Amino acid sequence: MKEITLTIDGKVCKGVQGDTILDVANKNDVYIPTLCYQKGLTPIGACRMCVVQLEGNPKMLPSCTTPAQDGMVVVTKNEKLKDYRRQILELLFAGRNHFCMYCSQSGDCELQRLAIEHEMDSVRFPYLYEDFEVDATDPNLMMDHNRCVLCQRCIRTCSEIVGAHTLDLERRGWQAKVIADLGKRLRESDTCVNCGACAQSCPTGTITIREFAYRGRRSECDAVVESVCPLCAVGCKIKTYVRTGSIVRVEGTGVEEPDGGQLCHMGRWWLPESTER
Amino acid sequence: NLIVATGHNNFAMNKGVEMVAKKYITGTNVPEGVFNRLEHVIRAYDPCLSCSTH
Amino acid sequence: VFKLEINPVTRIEGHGKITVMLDESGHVRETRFHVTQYRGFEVFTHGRDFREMPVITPRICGICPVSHHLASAKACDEILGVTITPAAHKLRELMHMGQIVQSHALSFFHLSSPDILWGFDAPVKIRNVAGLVDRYPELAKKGIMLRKFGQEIIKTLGGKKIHPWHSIPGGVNRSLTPQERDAIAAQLPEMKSIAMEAIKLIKDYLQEGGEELKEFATLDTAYMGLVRDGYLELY
Amino acid sequence: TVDVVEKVKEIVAPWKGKQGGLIPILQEVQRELGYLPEEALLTISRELKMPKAEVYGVATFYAQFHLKPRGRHVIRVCRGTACHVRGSLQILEKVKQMLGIEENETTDDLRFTLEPVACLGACGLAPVMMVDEDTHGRMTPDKIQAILDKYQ
Amino acid sequence: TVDVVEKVKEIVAPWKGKQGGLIPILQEVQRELGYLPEEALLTISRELKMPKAEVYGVATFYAQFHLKPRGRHVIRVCRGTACHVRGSLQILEKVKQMLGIEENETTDDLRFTLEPVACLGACGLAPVMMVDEDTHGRMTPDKIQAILDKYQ
Amino acid sequence: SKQHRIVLSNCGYIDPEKIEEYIARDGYMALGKALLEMTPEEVLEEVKKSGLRGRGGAGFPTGLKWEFAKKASGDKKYVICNADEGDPGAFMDRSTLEGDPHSVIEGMTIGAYVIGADEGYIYCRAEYPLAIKRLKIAIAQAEEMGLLGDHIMGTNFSFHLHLKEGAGAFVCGEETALMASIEGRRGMPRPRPPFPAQHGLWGKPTNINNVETWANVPRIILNGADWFASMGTEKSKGTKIFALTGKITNTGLIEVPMGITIREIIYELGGGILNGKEFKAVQIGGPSGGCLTKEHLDLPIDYESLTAAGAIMGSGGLVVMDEDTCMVDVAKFFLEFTQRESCGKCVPCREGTKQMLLMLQKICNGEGTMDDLSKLEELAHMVKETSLCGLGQTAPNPVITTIRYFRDEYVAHIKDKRCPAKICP
Ligand code: SF4
Ligand code: SF4
Ligand code: SF4
Ligand code: SF4
Ligand code: SF4
Ligand code: FES
Ligand code: FES
Ligand code: FES
Ligand code: FES
Ligand code: 3NI
């Protein structure tokens, strides 16, 4: 039977057979904390925050990658899962240098939303204060690597959605950094089409559009109007955020369409800049 | 480079503490009202020492 | 040979330390006034985008987070090379005036009003904002109202009271709708009354201690300020 | 500079149009050139039509690739379980403070290089401190000088 | 950096207050350090209270002083009258085009250095091409490879 | 001494560069037996009922693994030999590719016949500059005997046995990272599903099995089921090679039959301890495995009797540690090796292992507290329960186990300021 019936947090859920637990979760209503699942990009299993427990089975499995099997009891919120998710968030805060006081994305950060949700009034783990580089050579994008949870949603959105495969991982283990071509700066990169889809995929304020920093926040928007870019024929679908009579951020809907929300430079950088002429 | 408010008044505050000390000396017993006057010269400018030392 | 320390100097902002080095006879050889805190806002910022500076720089102080906000904003506006718009000028000036009002209200009523009222020899338990609320229930409330007026302007313009974000590099993020304009204007006959009563009180304090308070750390130095054509401009 | 553009463009010829083969395509430029310069990876990415970011990621992901010129004599100390329980860490830190160079980098003029390896096989004669030619079975704290001056 | 400040400040001690002695005071820092760094000349000028310009002028006026690090094996070819009439210029130019380095400078990684000298004495066995250890009596155009690979 | 060696029974005896001696040791007669008389399902049910508990560190009935590997929809299956060692002190796969370079070849030909695979790989580390040439010589000298080619033994079967030199990474020790390094890409464990036996190498089926588990396949059909059964206990079945090393008397491969009392594994087989001082611990699974100490003596070492003790019998890197070696020190060492050999995808193995390394370096120096120990225990349990592949799911075993067997010792490093091995206070 394609239509399978499960039980997430008591609430009964309905899904297609091949769907993962996160798909049948986001399909009905229920919320599972995720940081590395971008609707679209193939489920990458890096943050390990979406871990859910099956009844009887004492171990925990990611809801983004484990499939839904014909009837089963999934528990998403309890004490042990909350403890492990708080520990994961605290590891992320202790490893990288996260200062929310001055982050462009303090209100949109998905690591910040999760931290506040799990009442993270501490770090617990020793703060490793290592020096990760702040790549702001590009006049349009800035990559402040000490906020990088390492979710690869920027490598995947530049590998499978944009294609100009500019970003990949540098080293192994702890030294793993997101780099442009041959470990160079984003400005020095020949293969960046300056799209910004890396800024629409980054949940954690590492990659930010510079020109519209602190204004293109989704929490401080006055309105959210869906429309179509009028600059080219592709007519990308856009989700323009309006803050006091100006567009502050243009993120592209259509993560299910073949394009994948990768609006171009002219759409993520000329549309909000034209509301201020 | 930030040149902040209390910085320009640092010399005025130093010289003011000098002048209000040099008029309310006692060889011993070092009272508390003269301490309050030595603090009030600073509180006249009411300095944000956090700005001064960025 | 030996020295006195007033560490920590209280009812001021920050960390201070007055040392008074005396002689063998018990007379003041010399005094100095240290600030014993340093954070490094000239070495933090190397690498950061300049647009990050109007949000980093308000964290140098909470009594004047908009002063650093606006100075950083003018610095980044000269980095961009913008005009800037007259409406932005007047809104920035409104936020700066609100900050002037709130900082001077805190400076008079919270930090320096105990010495001005109860005298420099008053007991230490009464010399604070708390004993001021107790003994003078109306003056402390008036100072609180003036500080609240300033910070309501700052909050209306920039979201938060302390460390607001209202001035982008290039202009101003948010204007004033007529309702809150009228709300701010409807309290000005009362806040001006508060300010004038404080002016009269401090003028009676300075007129009472006639010549002593006229030589209380009064040294002749130079006076730097900002000026328009011939006027007093604060922005 | 022109010596590093055709040698890398010729070792890629028997891999054109074949799926896979970047791990071997590099193990060959490593054995030939001693290291993987940026020009090497650039030409590999050009010839295989593989992204430069992917090539650099694979080149820096695995330990036995060196993106900088490695020394003319490697000083592989064994930080395996058998040597470490025997106390090879002491030998490692003294060759560290003796060459004065960081943990996994080359000397300032390309004479030596310290490369902590896994078991070199002599888990009987522990600790082993291979000096790029032959095993060295005992290597107490004092026997490190009599070899580091000899091979230089 | 601190290794080059007291070794030069100690070899100058037996010359303080004595007229002359900058030619020897340098021939000693040359024999010890292999070359005369700018720090060396700076400390010589400080200690002897001789002008830095004079120290640099004497250091660059004479041939056997090298202000840059010389190689670990000198390749002194003889451009004397006896070798030149025999044709040593051919040997010199081929070691030139073979190491690819300029006339009187070191290799890029400090392995060799070409230093055209005067008569090394073997004006009978001409031309002589000393490779920092021993004489070499015949040195026809083909015998230059079999030694330059050996000493490296 | 006495060990009943059957896997590396020949090893050094047979000259590795000479195939004729190996076939003179009845070697490839299995291949013949399989390709001529034994129909594929028969060797399938043979190896299945043979109970060959997978020696790939995890433990598994590899007959069932091949049973999974066959039924995959496709026609381009593979068979891989993860000839790399997890423990960087283990030289078992090294010694087996040095001694008997043909057992693995014969076993993988058998298995590729069983599951219906044509292409196969052997991933051995490039940092073994002598095993590579022995294997390449073995591949050549088996190529010329019609053993890896078109219609091996005239049977309508194809098999090309490649040889991939490992780029030196323990991260590429699990299935999906091995399959990533073979496609020429960063070794990054993708989450299953897509499963390796269904959508593995190049999207085609894959049959990764251990080099020792492959080397046991020649002796499954030459002798029969009960032969492999008649070695020990009933739950786990077969025989394991062990890189017995450390500080006892004499290291080397000690292949003991089945669950045999740890006493007559270390006390008298190796023979005492160096300088005769009684041991205080033994690592029985390497870095992915736990520790056994002074209580697990009369215990069968079989796969079931020690997974509950907390130490998966992974690739036999047993190292003995007497009182002159600290347990916090070896815990930091193993966790440092793990931190150095990890991809960096999962937040638990990238940051957890870093912070656990920090907390262990702080407990060793004595700068630690009791909340430090509680945080170390909780982070260890979290990284075990949340990590992705299984390197990290078994990375804090040299902490967890050393907590459940040296707790007081841990306390003795923090509450009191003392350490058995006086290296640093
Ligand atoms: S990225 Fe998010 S969590 Fe990190 S500092 Fe910025 S707002 Fe805070
Ligand atoms: S701007 Fe576009 S092409 Fe460039 S890195 Fe970002 S997503 Fe990739
Ligand atoms: S830059 Fe952002 S999107 Fe990319 S890996 Fe880091 S946190 Fe994820
Ligand atoms: S976002 Fe760019 S590509 Fe898309 S319609 Fe607009 S201009 Fe065209
Ligand atoms: S646990 Fe995570 S980081 Fe560690 S090897 Fe597996 S995938 Fe990589
Ligand atoms: S959210 Fe499921 S693992 Fe990233
Ligand atoms: S233990 Fe160092 S050689 Fe294997
Ligand atoms: S002529 Fe060359 S040696 Fe004298
Ligand atoms: S572990 Fe640091 S000395 Fe015992
Ligand atoms: Ni201030």
Author numbering:
A (entry chain A): 1 to 277
B (entry chain D): 397 to 450
C (entry chain D): 4 to 238
D (entry chain C), E (entry chain H): 5 to 156
F (entry chain B): 113 to 537
The paper states:
In summary, we have described the cryo-EM structure of NiFe-HydABCSL, an electron-bifurcating hydrogenase consisting of a conventional NiFe-hydrogenase module (SL subunits) and of a bifurcating module (ABC subunits) that is highly similar to a previously characterized bifurcating heterotrimeric FeFe-hydrogenase. We report cryo-EM structures of the related NiFe-HydABCSL hydrogenase that reversibly oxidizes H2 and couples endergonic reduction of ferredoxin with exergonic reduction of NAD. Here, we report cryo–electron microscopy (cryo-EM) structures of NiFe-HydABCSL determined in a flavin-free apo state, in an “electron bifurcation-ready” (BR) state, and in a “post-electron bifurcation” (PB) state. The structures of the NiFe-enzyme show that none of the previous proposals for the site of bifurcation in [FeFe]-HydABC hydrogenases are likely to be correct and that instead electron bifurcation occurs at a single NAD(H)-binding flavin in combination with a unique arrangement of three iron-sulfur clusters.
No density for the expected FMN was observed in the EM map, indicating that the as-purified complex is in the flavin-free apo state. Flavoenzymes typically have a lower affinity for flavin in their reduced states, and in this regard, the absence of FMN in the NiFe-HydB structure is consistent with the reduced state of HydSL in our structure. Therefore, NiFe-HydSL is in the reduced active state and brief air exposure during EM grid preparation did not oxidize the catalytic center. The NTD and CTD of NiFe-HydB were partially flexible, although EM densities were clearly visible. In the FMN-free apo state structure of NiFe-HydABCSL, the distances between the C1 and B2 [2Fe-2S] clusters (19 Å) and between B2 and the B3 [4Fe-4S] clusters (18 Å) are too far to transfer electrons. Substantial conformational changes must therefore occur when FMN and/or NAD bind to enable electron transfer from FMN to B3, and this is discussed below. However, B5 is close enough to the C1 cluster (11 Å) for electron transfer in the FMN-free apo state, so the possibility of B5 being involved in electron transfer to Fd cannot be entirely ruled out. Direct electron transfer between B1 and C1 is highly unlikely based on our structure, as the closest (side-to-side) distance between them is more than 22 Å, which is too far for electron transfer to occur.
